[PDB]
Ligand binder design. Structure first.
Ligand code: HEM
Ligand code: HEM
Ligand code: HEM
Ligand code: HEM
Lengths: 142, 146, 142, 146
């Protein structure tokens, strides 16, 4: 669980980077696709599962929008992300193992973009937070 | 370490006594319930929205025997598993689009069901060699993912 | 999170297997040290890290005692297992990846021992619960 | 796949521009904060009970440079990583008692810090080849664990 310190740390960081969420989302999805090619199995319905393709840029921004939601709903992620969890559970059937792959890609991106803001202290709290999102997202699966 | 004779023996013993008709469906149907994400590739198998429907589904039962038998080729070619499976690997990747993490989930189900079948005979040493064998096959099933 | 159905399921199972806790404990740990020899890093203080050693036997019943505790605090694992969490976090410093490892061995053991009782349905709930236990033990780490 | 010329080039490049004095300490120190169970092996290093103490620890800093130079041998022996590391593997398993899962957590921190250092140049392409390389060393470090 996220302590008060964690929640303040995420909010503060998000406050700072939130403006580039779309760039972050494109970057992280492009790395996921190239560094962990097995995740491509979920995008077989697109013809362009290539780094920074139109489809990837678009999705990039929808995923980072869900993170923006999670930040605003950080006091009760389970409830906050309930609808996103059923969409993943029953329509997409995404293996929760992938959330961890994506989270790691997100941290690498933030790290290359905001080197000065991504302190070790921010890292621990964002890591706890993204694990928290992963758990929330997995709620309705079984 | 690759294969010790002991490992060879155990694998050989387990498969010469495998009751595919029991194990198959049970492993797959357990997998579909415990890791519901796996149902992504069974569109058309009929209703899989509840435990009971899954245990009774004949298509599930049949596909489970199909998958279990898919291990035979590994058993027969223990020193060439990667080469042997390359084809199945490409299939799951480009035609089925199966997330290779599911390979691992199913193996765990296989191990639990086999464990319930051999009881006490499923010693720590048997569990070891069996898991080692499944882990080699799962590795091979995911190498042609690009 | 555990539903009521999960809770009834674990409670009913435990009602049935709880008497053989010490055996399960020894079995499980013995499998964990054989099949996953890297977990031996934690028991280097013992001279007899071998399946069924008096050390394994004894420890197996201490661990299963913590599982008996969790079943009874099943409505609030976080608070119920706090003290266990501190011990693991500060004193043992056990990488929580290891929790998943043992959990898997516990399922194998229950399976070998109580095949009729370990149905697919009991399996989903006990798996959700052990995951539950793993997260509660990880609570005080960071 | 094992090594493509491109991967060989990317690895050689990164290492010839590596600032060990910088990344070294940063990676380890970041690991001790983010995955605190890794502090298990550093009693003697001084106090590590808070983030600032850790960052500022000189023992931590020096061991960070030690461990990062530790990949130099893999770089100069790209086709023989398992043989090269066997020794270090024995060391970590029998004298240090280090949980191998920790090898993987330090790698992620090395990746995260080098990423903050290279910024934009730390492309998806680089990331892939650097992770690949690290995963092969981690595999080699855990191989003598009986
Ligand atoms: C940080 C964790 C994640 C968040 C916040 C998230 C969020 C979302 C959102 C908000 C949508 C839907 C928008 C809509 O069309 O209504 C979505 C769709 C989707 N997500 Fe997730 N997602 C996450 C992780 C993943 C992972 C790891 C994968 C697998 C690689 C994945 C695969 C998909 C797919 C296949 C869709 C449908 C996209 C389309 O058809 O264009 N998601 N995601
Ligand atoms: C140990 C892991 C597995 C092995 C050895 C295995 C083996 C096989 C084999 C031999 C086939 C052959 C059918 C043909 O030649 O057309 C097959 C087909 C198939 N497998 Fe896999 N399988 C494994 C895991 C899985 C999992 C976990 C899933 C789903 C989550 C899956 C989904 C499928 C599907 C959908 C087919 C096609 C059946 C059809 O033709 O309708 N497999 N598998
Ligand atoms: C289901 C998860 C677990 C539970 C409920 C659990 C519970 C416990 C309990 C209750 C004790 C203390 C005995 C006492 O009161 O003296 C203990 C000690 C210990 N546990 Fe955990 N544990 C779990 C998982 C693990 C794992 C996965 C590892 C490492 C691989 C581990 C390593 C240890 C060690 C090293 C000790 C000290 C033992 C000694 O020297 O006697 N535990 N655990
Ligand atoms: C990429 C991963 C790592 C590499 C390449 C690596 C490399 C090295 C090397 C080359 C040594 C040589 C010391 C000697 O020859 O005396 C060493 C020592 C040591 N390493 Fe590792 N290491 C790694 C990860 C870790 C981790 C994750 C830990 C703890 C979690 C750890 C703990 C230690 C300790 C305690 C020593 C002994 C230092 C002393 O007091 O002399 N290492 N490491």
């Amino acid at each position: 669980s996220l302590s008060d310190k964690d929640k303040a740390a995420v909010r503060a960081l998000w406050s700072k980077i939130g403006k580039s969420a779309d760039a972050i989302g494109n970057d992280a999805l492009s790395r996921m696709i190239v560094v962990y090619p097995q995740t491509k199995t979920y995008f077989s319905h697109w013809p362009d599962v290539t780094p920074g393709s139109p489809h990837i840029k678009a999705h990039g921004k929808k995923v980072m929008g869900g993170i923006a939601l999670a930040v605003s709903k950080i006091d009760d992620l389970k409830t906050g992300l309930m609808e996103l969890s059923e969409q993943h559970a029953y329509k997409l059937r995404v293996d929760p193992a992938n959330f961890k792959i994506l989270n790691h890609c997100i941290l690498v991106v933030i790290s290359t973009m905001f080197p000065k803001e991504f302190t070790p202290e921010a890292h621990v709290s964002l890591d706890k937070f993204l694990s928290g999102v992963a758990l929330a997202l997995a709620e309705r699966y079984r | 370490v690759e294969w010790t004779d002991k490992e060879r023996s155990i694998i050989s013993d387990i498969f010469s006594h495998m009751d595919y008709d029991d194990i198959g469906p049970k492993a797959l149907s357990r997998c579909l319930i415990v890791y519901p994400w796996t149902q992504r590739h069974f569109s058309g198998f009929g209703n899989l929205y509840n435990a009971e429907a899954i245990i009774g589904n004949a298509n599930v039962a049949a596909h489970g025997i199909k998958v279990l038998h898919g291990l035979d080729r590994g058993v027969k070619n223990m020193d060439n598993i990667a080469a042997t499976y390359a084809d199945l690997s490409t299939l799951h990747s480009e035609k089925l689009h199966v997330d290779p993490d599911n390979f691992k989930l199913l193996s765990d189900c296989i191990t639990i069901v086999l464990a319930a079948k051999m009881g006490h005979a499923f010693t720590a040493e048997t569990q070891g060699a069996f898991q080692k064998f499944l882990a080699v096959v799962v590795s091979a099933l995911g190498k042609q993912y690009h």
